[PDB]
């Protein structure tokens, strides 16, 4: 239940965003030349919110804008993530100037979220005018699923989304649904917009086997590198510059919904290819056959991807989730946040999962089997 997105509220986010920009202007961090460039994303976010206000330039237009379900979620999320970034500098202290630290890692995670939020608002409010109820989902079979379950909604809670997705593509576990959430919920706000749904369905098409494509291509494929800048792709492949056909595929925060395959050419150079509006597995199959994509991440074994033309372990889902921000999500249901701690073992879960466990098995903690001497409500930050 977020507050109305009135002018007063919108401006509170600008002041919080200016605070993040000031903290990030410190030369000790060296963030001026540090992607995704938070010192560029936050001013651009300001200019977009300003462009939107110019389009809703009267009291009646401001009343419609402040009631817009997507806009309220956006401003509330922008507010939350900005406060989170200020809190990161407050508690990180000198560990913010060390590039390998977890505090710096969390700032890169926040910088990626602000990048995704900016691309989202520009897609939903092109030219500052709301067009979410007329957003074009690139895949028709994915568009039909969205229209079927959510009508003309532009954004829906993750918990409603997951359940409706399960009705068409079965999700096998709590860890799989958590890995899935960190993949689709790019803005890390516990909601899925039609834009985030379009990116996910473009990346892992065809829709008919989208969870098999995602499990193979992203959860277990050695060639998958998640978000990388081109300099990082080159740095990764430089080790294998002596092995033509070495390759990796990555996401690009400036080309959402598309893949970029970086590869070692016969003459030692590192080049990249952006596949067309076709499945990534077909581009990898064609490239393997043609001698360009042979060794994923320089490794001799290239997985057989032909099965996708016509089994992931719980540990693999756990490693996959580490990169994202899902530590606050209940591992059992993957739909509610952790809000209770079991005493004395310290394991965490949501209130309703603990009540369900207590009425079903209840013979110790559902994770370690230790006797439940007590419970204590808690608030979990994604970076705890
Ligand atoms: C663009 C450049 C900027 C400098 C850091 N490098 C490396 C880097 C990549 C990711 C991250 C970091 C860091 F913040 F943890 F530090 C760092 C985080 N990160 C990230 C954050 C949330 C979700 C994901 C996805 C993912 N891929 N494998 C597992 N997961 C959960 C890709 C989404 C569709 C789901 C990835 C990177 O890609 C990326
Ligand atoms: Na989201
Ligand atoms: Zn739960
Ligand atoms: Zn326990």
| Cβ–Cβ < 8 Å for 236, 229 | no
DSSP secondary structure string, 158-189? HHHHHHHHHTTS----HHHHHHHHHHH-TT-S
Residue identifier of the C-alpha nearest atom 33 of ligand 1: 183
Q: Which residue has the tokens 């959430």?
A: 181
As a dihedral over the C-alpha atoms of residue 250, residue 156, residue 172, residue 180, rounded to 10 degrees, the angle is 20
CB under 8 A, 24+ apart: contacts of 29-36: 29/96, 29/97, 29/104, 30/99, 35/111, 35/229, 35/253, 36/111, 36/112, 36/114, 36/115, 36/253, 36/254
Distance between CA atoms of residues 235 and 229, nearest Å? 10
Q: Give the E-state strand segments of the chain in sequence order.
A: 155-157, 191-193, 224-227, 246-251, 259-264, 270-273, 295-296, 340-343, 348-349, 374-377
34 CB less than 6 Å from ligand 1? no
36 CB less than 6 Å from ligand 1? yes
CA distances from 148 to 96, 145, 204, 209 (A): 46, 5, 20, 18
274 CB less than 6 Å from ligand 1? no
Taking the alpha carbons of 198, 281, 320, 111 in that order, is the dihedral positive or negative? negative
Give the domain ranges of the chain: 7-131, 135-217, 222-302, 327-384
Rounded to 5 degrees, φ, ψ at 151 are 60, -125
Distance between CA atoms of residues 184 and 200, nearest Å? 6
- Residue 371 CA to ligand 4 center (angstroms) comes to 8
Strand partners, 374: 343
Closest C-alpha among 288, 291, 290, 262 to residue 274: 262
**Helical axes 7-24 vs 38-55, angle rounded to 10°:** 160
Question: Ligand 1: which of 227, 318, 328 to mutate, most ligand atoms within 8 Å of CB?
Answer: 227
Cβ-based neighbours of 286, under 8 Å, separated by 6 or more: none
As a dihedral over the C-alpha atoms of residue 186, residue 190, residue 191, residue 192, rounded to 10 degrees, the angle is 40
Write out the CATH class of domain 327-384. alpha beta
268 DSSP 8-state letter: S
The verdict on domain 222-302 having CATH code 3.40.50.300 is no
109 CB less than 6 Å from ligand 1? yes
**How was this model experimentally determined?**
X-ray
Distance between CA atoms of residues 113 and 61, nearest Å? 28
CA distances from 70 to 43, 132, 358 (A): 21, 8, 37
Residue identifier of the C-alpha nearest atom 24 of ligand 1: 324
Question: Ligand 1: which of 34, 100, 109, 112 to mutate, most ligand atoms within 8 Å of CB?
Answer: 112
| Chain centre distance of CA 363 | 36
Kindly give the pairing relationship between strand 224-227 and strand 155-157: unpaired
Between CA 185 and CA 123, with CA 260 as vertex, the angle to 5 degrees is 45
| Cβ–Cβ < 8 Å for 56, 67 | no
Distance between CA atoms of residues 167 and 164, nearest Å? 5
User: Three-state DSSP class for 241?
Assistant: coil
| Chain centre distance of CA 150 | 21
Closest C-alpha among 39, 40, 43, 65 to residue 54: 65
Strand partners, 192: 156
Closest C-alpha among 201, 205, 185 to residue 193: 185
Strand partners, 270: 264
| Cβ–Cβ < 8 Å for 209, 308 | yes
Q: Which residue has the tokens 């993040």?
A: 20
233 CB less than 6 Å from ligand 1? no
- Residue 187 CA to ligand 1 center (angstroms) comes to 12
244 CB less than 6 Å from ligand 1? no
Question: Ligand 1: which of 323, 324, 326, 328 to mutate, most ligand atoms within 8 Å of CB?
Answer: 323
Q: Given its phi and psi angles, is residue 133 left (phi above 0), alpha (psi -120 to 50 degrees) or beta?
A: alpha
Same fold, 7-131 and 327-384: no
Taking the alpha carbons of 323, 324, 327, 332 in that order, is the dihedral positive or negative? negative
Structure tokens at 250: 């990555």
Other CB atoms closer than 10 Å to residue 153's CB: what's the count? 17
229 CB less than 6 Å from ligand 1? yes
Other CB atoms closer than 10 Å to residue 285's CB: what's the count? 17
| Cβ–Cβ < 8 Å for 125, 93 | no
**Residues flagged as binding site for 4-O-phospho-L-tyrosine:** 250
Tell me which ligand sits closest to the C-alpha of residue 161.
2
253 CB less than 6 Å from ligand 1? yes
What is the architecture, at CATH level 2, of domain 135-217?
Orthogonal Bundle (1.10)
User: Three-state DSSP class for 296?
Assistant: strand
Distance between CA atoms of residues 34 and 88, nearest Å? 17
2 DSSP 8-state letter: P
| Chain centre distance of CA 253 | 11
7-131: CATH, from 3.40.30.10, 1.20.1640.10, 3.30.70.360, 1.20.930.20 = 1.20.930.20
CA distances from 78 to 118, 189, 257 (A): 10, 9, 22
Strand partners, 340: 349, 377
Half-sphere CA count of 375, side-chain side, radius 13 A: 15
Structure tokens at 86: 């200020």
In ligand 1, the atom with minimum distance to the C-alpha of 320 is: 29
In ligand 1, the atom with minimum distance to the C-alpha of 321 is: 31
- Residue 312 CA to ligand 3 center (angstroms) comes to 22
CA distances from 316 to 32, 148, 179, 196, 220 (A): 35, 32, 10, 24, 7
Distance between CA atoms of residues 17 and 77, nearest Å? 12
Q: Which residue has the tokens 């010192």?
A: 39
- Residue 292 CA to ligand 2 center (angstroms) comes to 36
Distance between CA atoms of residues 246 and 250, nearest Å? 14
Other CB atoms closer than 10 Å to residue 5's CB: what's the count? 23
| Chain centre distance of CA 246 | 27
Instruction: Mark out the alpha helices in 248-309 (DSSP H runs).
Output: 280-289
């Amino acid at each position: 239940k977020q507050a109305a997105a009135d002018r007063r509220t919108v401006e509170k986010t600008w002041k919080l965003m200016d605070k993040v920009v000031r903290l990030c202007q410190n030369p000790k961090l060296q963030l001026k030349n540090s992607p995704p460039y938070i010192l560029d994303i936050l001013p651009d976010t300001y200019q977009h919110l300003r462009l939107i206000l110019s389009k809703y330039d009267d009291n009646q237009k401001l009343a419609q804008l402040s009631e817009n379900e997507y806009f309220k979620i956006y401003i509330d999320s922008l507010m939350k993530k900005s406060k989170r970034a200020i809190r990161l500098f407050k508690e990180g202290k000198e560990r913010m100037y060390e590039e390998q630290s977890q505090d710096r890692r969390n700032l890169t995670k926040l910088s990626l979220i602000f990048s995704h939020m900016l691309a989202e608002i520009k897609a939903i409010f092109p030219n500052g005018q709301f067009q979410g109820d007329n957003f074009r989902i690139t895949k028709a079979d994915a568009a039909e699923f969205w229209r079927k379950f959510f009508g003309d909604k532009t954004i829906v809670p993750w918990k409603v989304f997951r359940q409706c997705l399960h009705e068409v593509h079965q999700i096998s576990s709590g860890l799989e649904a958590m890995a899935l959430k960190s993949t689709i919920d790019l803005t890390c706000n516990d909601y899925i917009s039609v834009f985030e749904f379009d990116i996910f369905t473009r990346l892992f098409q065809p829709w008919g086997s989208i969870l098999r494509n995602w499990n193979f291509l992203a959860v277990t494929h050695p060639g998958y590198m998640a978000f990388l800048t081109y300099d990082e792709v080159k740095a990764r492949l430089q080790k294998y510059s002596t092995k033509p056909g070495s390759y990796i595929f990555r996401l690009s925060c400036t080309r959402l919904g598309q893949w970029a395959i970086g590869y070692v050419t016969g003459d030692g150079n590192i080049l990249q290819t952006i596949p067309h509006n076709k499945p990534l597995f077909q581009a990898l199959i064609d490239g393997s056959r043609e001698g360009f994509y042979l060794y994923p991440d320089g490794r001799s074994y290239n997985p057989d991807l032909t099965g996708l033309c016509e089994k992931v372990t719980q540990e693999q889902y756990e490693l996959y989730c580490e990169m994202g921000s899902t530590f606050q999500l209940c591992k059992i249901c993957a739909e509610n946040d952790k809000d209770v701690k079991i005493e004395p073992c310290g394991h965490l879960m949501c209130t309703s999962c603990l009540t369900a466990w207590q009425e079903s098995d209840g013979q110790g903690c559902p994770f370690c089997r230790c006797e439940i001497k007590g419970t204590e409500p808690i608030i979990v930050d994604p970076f705890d």
